[PDB]
Symmetry: C3
Amino acid sequence: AVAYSVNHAGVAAIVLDRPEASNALDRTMKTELLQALLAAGGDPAVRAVVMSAAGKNFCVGQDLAEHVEALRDDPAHAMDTVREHYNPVLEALDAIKVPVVVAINGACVGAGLGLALGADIRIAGQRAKFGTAFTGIGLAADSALSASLPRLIGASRATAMFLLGDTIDAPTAHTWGLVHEVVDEGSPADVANSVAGRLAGGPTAAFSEVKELLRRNAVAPLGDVLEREASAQQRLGASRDHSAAVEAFLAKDKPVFVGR
Amino acid sequence: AAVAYSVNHAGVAAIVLDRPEASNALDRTMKTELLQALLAAGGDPAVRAVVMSAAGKNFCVGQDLAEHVEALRDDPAHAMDTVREHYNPVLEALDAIKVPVVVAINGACVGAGLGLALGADIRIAGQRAKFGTAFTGIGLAADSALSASLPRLIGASRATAMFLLGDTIDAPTAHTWGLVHEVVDEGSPADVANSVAGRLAGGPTAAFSEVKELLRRNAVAPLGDVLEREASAQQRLGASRDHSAAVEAFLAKDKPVFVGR
Amino acid sequence: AAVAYSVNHAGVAAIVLDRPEASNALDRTMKTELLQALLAAGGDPAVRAVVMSAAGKNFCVGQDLAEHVEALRDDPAHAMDTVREHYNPVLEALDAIKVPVVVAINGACVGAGLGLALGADIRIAGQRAKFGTAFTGIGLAADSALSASLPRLIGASRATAMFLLGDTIDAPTAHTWGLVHEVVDEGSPADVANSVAGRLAGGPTAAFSEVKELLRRNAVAPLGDVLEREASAQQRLGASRDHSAAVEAFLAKDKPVFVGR
């Protein structure tokens, strides 16, 4: 239901594989997704992660039928899944230190959007549609979407998407900063795999450091920004990948990077 | 009188700046009445959405000139007491409104007028709207939360340019920059703002209040806090009447009817 | 000699990178002299604006390669000492300047050169200016505050692509993204920057300093703190000479002269 593999080049592939339900997230999906993300995060050989999905739609979020059962069974506790399933998935995704690429086809809504916005690089097919969804069904937000959406497109457009509840299309998402590239529908997994392959061959420690600097320094005082930068640069200055790159540059030559 | 207040049958509170002869310049009367209207809208359980608009050609030119001149001649050291006394409670009252706030912006929107407009959630601009900080043009800095609201909407760089260079920007620029959500024909901002408020007033009001609070609280929060707050908000709403109604509507592939609880 | 410093008649401090033969690559001499120029500018009470520019075709290609190679071969474990010893004080010194800072960007602006440029308030680029982070290209991450300043200017998505994929952008992309305020003909950026700096220098310098500090303090502050700080700053400016001058001049349909207090 969620496929996981790590190839020779150290690219971990996580594929949502429930296309008949538009990759709607039932307990089986949520459990296997968590496992896939934790494995990617805990494997020292993984130098990049690519997240993709089978069928026409990336992820429509929570499985409706499973939600109906919980709601009819115990309405005061029907959102237990947020703590039990969604939160650890988002934390597992966040814990991944290497670059994460996502290939977004068709519908990407609710927790599906939440999952996608947790990646570092986002590639959309031309017919991709992005939506908060939660307020449409009288809910607010989960899957970190109340933070990740405004941080990518700003508070004003995030607020509009949540209150008006309308889907936006791929070009609008590109213009707004929600995704990095728009490609032909059916091509985003191929492009994401190439981008992930390219990242996996790069200086993995440098990528992990800069990713962490970016997260920590978003709103920090300048003094803290500069101190953390200095320390990260000192660690990388001593890395094998840094000497290899400098030596390659002097030799008018292309470096091979190994991630340390 | 100077600020008109009413609440319709749909639960839309309408707030109208009604001093068009002075381009809705904020004197003591305007400020005191604006506060009362905002507090009334914020405290009324029946209000499901708020719409802010302005009579005449211009939305709001900010602080009343004559009145400020009197204060400045009378006592230069205390000429800006009104910021604490009037503008700050106004911005807190607007911020305290839990439900969606929509504003129709026509013509000049500058100074405290701009601060007021940027406190709204959805901003609808007329073709001939003009936005400007105005403060440094007369040797002041900023009030009406504009030193936070502007950079949060258009980014630090463009906000810094508006404040330092005193650049006024037009409607399509404001749109592209993210200062307003839509640009329509001049004269229409009110009508479009009213439709939008009406639409939002018919939506899941408890969910709208929750998500607005989540967006505000989670802007720079650690992930663990973001996720905990989201879990709690969803659990509160999972027990709402609107959520059950929406679930059974979705099962039939209908759009739900919402009552706001 | 490596960095030129002067303060003109109008209180404009000019800082010019003047190692054109090396595309203004920052070696120890250059870094030390840049720090002294920024400290002089920040501590001089006659200074009312700052303009940063560079001789030759390229603004600044960042760290000097030859000096870096020598440190790396001598002692790899400490090869980045310079970040703490040189770059960090430079960025703090730039940040400590209270008055407006304008930068003119010709040609290549990469690495620490980009960091330096993004610490300015107003950025004017020539048509052939190019911007890149460069660090990960050689297995480093970030310095010169770029892990903060870049995403704060262009957003998290674009900054992440620049850092991770090594995407280099040209002037019109930079303009659309909000990385620079203006693109002019190559070989006009310093001219335009000087005009802008000159206009800012003749402006209400105390007001400019207050609003810049308000913008920085209030970026992520709670509304109560935002409003309190705005009121205090407005009260201080309300009693300034420049503010009275502005108001008297507007009443007499006349241009005001500002002295910065």
